[PDB]
Enzyme design. Structure first.
Site, PDB file in Angstrom:
ATOM      1  N   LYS A   1      83.280  29.528 -64.989  1.00 28.38           N
ATOM      2  CA  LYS A   1      84.531  29.521 -64.239  1.00 28.38           C
ATOM      3  C   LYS A   1      85.314  28.223 -64.379  1.00 28.38           C
ATOM      4  O   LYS A   1      86.544  28.258 -64.466  1.00 28.38           O
ATOM      5  CB  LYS A   1      84.253  29.783 -62.756  1.00 28.38           C
ATOM      6  N   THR A   2      84.637  27.073 -64.400  1.00 29.85           N
ATOM      7  CA  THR A   2      85.357  25.808 -64.502  1.00 29.85           C
ATOM      8  C   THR A   2      85.951  25.611 -65.892  1.00 29.85           C
ATOM      9  O   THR A   2      87.025  25.011 -66.024  1.00 29.85           O
ATOM     10  CB  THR A   2      84.431  24.645 -64.151  1.00 29.85           C
TER      11      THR A   2
ATOM     12  N   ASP B   1      87.139  22.419 -58.045  1.00 27.97           N
ATOM     13  CA  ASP B   1      86.008  23.236 -58.450  1.00 27.97           C
ATOM     14  C   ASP B   1      84.837  23.024 -57.503  1.00 27.97           C
ATOM     15  O   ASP B   1      84.675  21.951 -56.912  1.00 27.97           O
ATOM     16  CB  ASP B   1      85.583  22.914 -59.885  1.00 27.97           C
ATOM     17  N   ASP B   2      84.017  24.065 -57.367  1.00 32.90           N
ATOM     18  CA  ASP B   2      82.846  24.040 -56.497  1.00 32.90           C
ATOM     19  C   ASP B   2      83.256  23.730 -55.056  1.00 32.90           C
ATOM     20  O   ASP B   2      82.890  22.704 -54.479  1.00 32.90           O
ATOM     21  CB  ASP B   2      81.811  23.034 -57.005  1.00 32.90           C
TER      22      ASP B   2
ATOM     23  N   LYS C   1      99.002  24.635 -47.946  1.00 32.25           N
ATOM     24  CA  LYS C   1     100.312  25.205 -47.653  1.00 32.25           C
ATOM     25  C   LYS C   1     101.331  24.131 -47.286  1.00 32.25           C
ATOM     26  O   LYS C   1     102.261  24.394 -46.514  1.00 32.25           O
ATOM     27  CB  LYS C   1     100.220  26.245 -46.533  1.00 32.25           C
TER      28      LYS C   1
ATOM     29  N   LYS D   1      76.367  30.970 -69.904  1.00 27.33           N
ATOM     30  CA  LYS D   1      75.602  29.729 -69.832  1.00 27.33           C
ATOM     31  C   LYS D   1      74.104  30.012 -69.858  1.00 27.33           C
ATOM     32  O   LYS D   1      73.341  29.360 -70.587  1.00 27.33           O
ATOM     33  CB  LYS D   1      75.995  28.971 -68.563  1.00 27.33           C
TER      34      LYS D   1
HETATM   35  N1  LIG Z   1      84.096  32.465 -73.319  1.00 24.72           N
HETATM   36  C1  LIG Z   1      83.662  31.434 -72.604  1.00 24.72           C
HETATM   37  N2  LIG Z   1      84.093  31.294 -71.330  1.00 24.72           N
HETATM   38  C2  LIG Z   1      83.646  30.254 -70.618  1.00 24.72           C
HETATM   39  N3  LIG Z   1      82.795  29.295 -70.970  1.00 24.72           N
HETATM   40  C3  LIG Z   1      82.382  29.469 -72.232  1.00 24.72           C
HETATM   41  C4  LIG Z   1      82.754  30.478 -73.089  1.00 24.72           C
HETATM   42  N4  LIG Z   1      82.117  30.326 -74.312  1.00 24.72           N
HETATM   43  C5  LIG Z   1      81.380  29.249 -74.170  1.00 24.72           C
HETATM   44  N5  LIG Z   1      81.510  28.682 -72.935  1.00 24.72           N
HETATM   45  C6  LIG Z   1      80.810  27.506 -72.450  1.00 24.72           C
HETATM   46  O1  LIG Z   1      79.852  27.944 -71.514  1.00 24.72           O
HETATM   47  C7  LIG Z   1      79.702  26.966 -70.454  1.00 24.72           C
HETATM   48  C8  LIG Z   1      80.061  27.616 -69.141  1.00 24.72           C
HETATM   49  O2  LIG Z   1      79.581  26.796 -68.044  1.00 24.72           O
HETATM   50  P1  LIG Z   1      80.534  26.469 -66.805  1.00 24.72           P
HETATM   51  O3  LIG Z   1      80.192  25.126 -66.266  1.00 24.72           O
HETATM   52  O4  LIG Z   1      81.945  26.692 -67.213  1.00 24.72           O
HETATM   53  O5  LIG Z   1      80.105  27.604 -65.756  1.00 24.72           O
HETATM   54  P2  LIG Z   1      80.094  27.727 -64.160  1.00 24.72           P
HETATM   55  O6  LIG Z   1      79.986  29.145 -63.752  1.00 24.72           O
HETATM   56  O7  LIG Z   1      81.178  26.887 -63.596  1.00 24.72           O
HETATM   57  O8  LIG Z   1      78.709  27.032 -63.792  1.00 24.72           O
HETATM   58  P3  LIG Z   1      77.828  27.015 -62.457  1.00 24.72           P
HETATM   59  O9  LIG Z   1      78.056  28.341 -61.795  1.00 24.72           O
HETATM   60  O10 LIG Z   1      76.414  26.816 -62.904  1.00 24.72           O
HETATM   61  O11 LIG Z   1      78.339  25.857 -61.659  1.00 24.72           O
HETATM   62  C9  LIG Z   1      80.581  25.787 -70.881  1.00 24.72           C
HETATM   63  O12 LIG Z   1      79.843  24.851 -71.652  1.00 24.72           O
HETATM   64  C10 LIG Z   1      81.658  26.480 -71.714  1.00 24.72           C
HETATM   65  O13 LIG Z   1      82.298  25.596 -72.603  1.00 24.72           O
END
Ligand SMILES: Nc1ncnc2c1ncn2[C@@H]1O[C@H](COP(=O)(O)OP(=O)(O)OP(=O)(O)O)[C@@H](O)[C@H]1O
EC number: 3.6.4.6
Lengths: 523, 83
Positions: free
Chosen positions: A332-333, A386-387, A414, A491
């Site tokens: 998501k981030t 984020d988070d 807002k 991930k």
């Molecule tokens: N299509 C894609 N969309 C998103 N991230 C991708 C994609 N392909 C590869 N990645 C990589 O996968 C990883 C995704 O991890 P990310 O930190 O964005 O997830 P997150 O859900 O925020 O993590 P968490 O829930 O553990 O906090 C990153 O290293 C990102 O660059």
């Protein structure tokens, strides 16, 4: 007339401040003195210039001294007034008013203008010696006898430590703020340095001065000169074979060239900036790039573009918000960072809990407030948080959380920026129910959903894009996973692949599949 | 050097002898008269206590940190002392 230019001062931005002064701060001077005396008004005689160290302040003062048919400004460098003997310092302070009093008596206010320049006035103004000096200066500037042809200019980097009485009207009227050496000034300085060598054809043509100017940030003139000298050192040492003894020089020690390689080597490992610079580590939040394993990524990106263009071209919705949603390990981030990067806005920043460890509620609130205050100065800006659950630290037991941070976020979500400015906010979280139960989901204007790999064909496409497994293993994987659904995040998939690749080729496939079976689940 | 040179002020005394010394040193090293046939070396254990002014371009401006040696340095030192 004064006809302000501010391009006369050989700098940038003064446009606004010059305008201010020429039009309204200073103006009585041009106006006929008789009427000024008749009605009232008071000529300004106190200006204070505050900012980080730099060459702009002295250059501005010299320009002003050239900006009028005045005398030669009297400049005092540091606390030279302070003396061992009793009475010498105030005596000298009075001694400085020589020509002023001469013109303030022989021709009174109808004489030439007097300019006084104070360097590091904070040192002398802020115990008997210091208080006596301050009182003497205050009386001399404003006392029983009034001088109408004396102007005092002070420069400091710590305006907070100056005496308040010295800021009373009629003592220090005008306030001026300084900044740092801009890109154009850096290019000018680099040209003033390099050109000398350019004329002799001794400089390699491969050097590109614009690139060097771009790389150098927060470097003052002395730092740029030192960097040039270090480049010269690295160039000349090519012929200095000096060693434990010191042989020095060769038959080609002359006709040296300050090559680009020398410049870069000196910049990286020889000369370090005294202030540093900013930092945008998008690679930190995007480590493995974005791979299009399906349709959802395109949908998310398109919605992001729609939101960005709505923010850019709206009149009665200057503030827009959106929330990124999905299960954990869904990436998501990274998507939020990609959307922010594709926004192409002057101001972009990220607020993450990684920078606030061990902080209390007040510190987190102050950090968020500072970030938003900085964002409010630009014309159109974007911010991503984020988070959220890690920001207002939440635990299912109790439950427990921080109320101050939650209320601050609810208030900030807002609050519109000043008139004529635009702000975009993107929030990411993996727990929608908790936010909804806090009555926080109604503050966001809209929401988007981040899905997980569902069908086996998407998993096979992701494997093919990653290019880790070959056709032989792919056939068996497709055979065993095609006729069933899956549930995994990208991930976690990368982690599983990395974990499984350790073992020998004979077992890898099985191991991988075993892991895929243990991590399986359904929504 | 830190015994002589300390931040201006930050001292509780009426004589004020710790500031005139620093000012005289600053004037002599870098003053109106241009003296360019001298090199000054100053070593200290606490770089922070040194007055910030002395550490800047023009004044000093080259500073070295001597850290604990490595395995090769330890071997060389032991050889030197056991020769
Ligand atoms: N299509 C894609 N969309 C998103 N991230 C991708 C994609 N392909 C590869 N990645 C990589 O996968 C990883 C995704 O991890 P990310 O930190 O964005 O997830 P997150 O859900 O925020 O993590 P968490 O829930 O553990 O906090 C990153 O290293 C990102 O660059």
């Amino acid at each position: 007339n004064p006809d302000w230019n501010f391009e006369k001062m050989g700098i940038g931005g003064l446009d606004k401040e010059f305008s201010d002064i020429f039009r309204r701060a200073f103006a009585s001077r041009v106006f006929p003195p008789e009427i000024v005396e008749q009605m009232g008004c008071k000529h300004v005689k106190g200006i204070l210039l505050y900012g980080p160290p730099g060459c702009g302040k002295t250059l501005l003062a010299r320009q002003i001294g050239k900006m009028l048919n005045a005398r030669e400004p009297k400049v005092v460098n540091g606390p030279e007034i302070l003396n061992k003997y009793v009475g010498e310092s105030e005596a000298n302070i009075r001694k400085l008013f020589a020509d002023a009093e001469e013109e303030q008596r022989r021709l009174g206010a109808n004489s030439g203008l007097h300019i006084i320049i104070f360097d590091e006035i904070d040192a002398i103004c802020k115990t008997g010696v210091h208080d006596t000096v301050v009182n003497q200066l205050l009386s001399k500037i404003d006392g029983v006898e009034q001088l109408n042809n004396i102007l005092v200019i002070g420069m400091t980097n710590r305006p907070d430590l100056i005496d308040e009485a010295l800021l009373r009207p009629g003592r220090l009227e005008v306030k001026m703020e300084i900044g740092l050496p801009d890109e154009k000034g850096r290019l000018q300085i680099l040209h003033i340095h390099t050109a000398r060598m350019r004329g002799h054809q001794l400089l390699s043509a491969d050097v590109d001065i614009k690139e060097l100017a771009v790389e150098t940030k927060n470097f003052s003139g002395a730092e740029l000169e030192g960097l040039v000298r270090a480049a010269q050192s690295t160039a000349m040492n090519r012929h200095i074979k000096a060693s434990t003894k010191v042989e020095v020089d060769m038959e080609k020690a002359e006709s040296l060239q300050v090559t680009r390689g020398d410049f870069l080597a000196s910049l990286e490992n020889d000369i370090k900036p005294a202030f540093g610079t900013n930092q945008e580590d998008y690679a930190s939040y995007i480590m493995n790039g974005i791979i299009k394993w399906g349709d959802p990524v395109t949908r998310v990106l398109d919605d992001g573009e729609l939101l960005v263009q709505q923010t850019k071209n709206s009149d009665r919705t200057p503030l827009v918000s959106v929330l990124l949603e999905g299960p954990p390990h869904s990436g998501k981030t990274a998507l939020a960072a990609k959307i922010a990067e594709e926004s192409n806005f002057p101001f972009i920043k990220i607020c993450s809990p990684d920078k606030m460890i061990g902080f209390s509620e007040t510190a987190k609130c102050q950090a968020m407030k500072k970030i938003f205050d900085d964002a409010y100065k630009s014309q159109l800006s974007c911010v991503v948080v984020d988070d959220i659950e890690r920001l207002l630290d939440y635990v299912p037991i109790g439950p427990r959380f921080s109320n101050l941070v939650l209320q601050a976020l609810l208030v900030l979500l807002k609050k519109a920026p000043p008139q004529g400015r635009k702000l975009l906010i993107i929030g990411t979280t993996s727990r929608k129910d908790v936010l909804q139960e806090m009555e926080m989901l109604n503050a966001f204007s809209t929401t988007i959903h981040v899905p997980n790999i569902a069908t086996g064909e998407q998993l096979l496409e992701a494997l093919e894009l990653l290019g880790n497994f070959k056709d032989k293993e792919r056939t068996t994987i497709a055979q065993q996973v095609k006729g069933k659904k899956v549930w995994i995040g990208i991930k976690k998939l990368l982690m599983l692949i990395e974990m499984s690749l350790q073992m020998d080729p004979e077992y890898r496939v099985r191991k991988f599949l075993a892991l895929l079976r243990e991590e399986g689940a359904s929504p | 050097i830190d015994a002589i040179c300390k931040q201006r002020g930050s001292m509780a005394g009426s004589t004020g002898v710790h500031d005139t010394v620093v000012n005289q040193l600053l004037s002599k090293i870098d003053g109106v008269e241009q003296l360019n046939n001298i090199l000054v070396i100053g070593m200290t254990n606490r770089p922070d206590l040194i007055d910030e002014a002395l550490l800047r371009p023009g004044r000093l401006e080259v500073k070295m940190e001597i850290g604990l040696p490595d395995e090769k340095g330890r071997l060389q030192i032991l050889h030197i002392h056991t020769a």
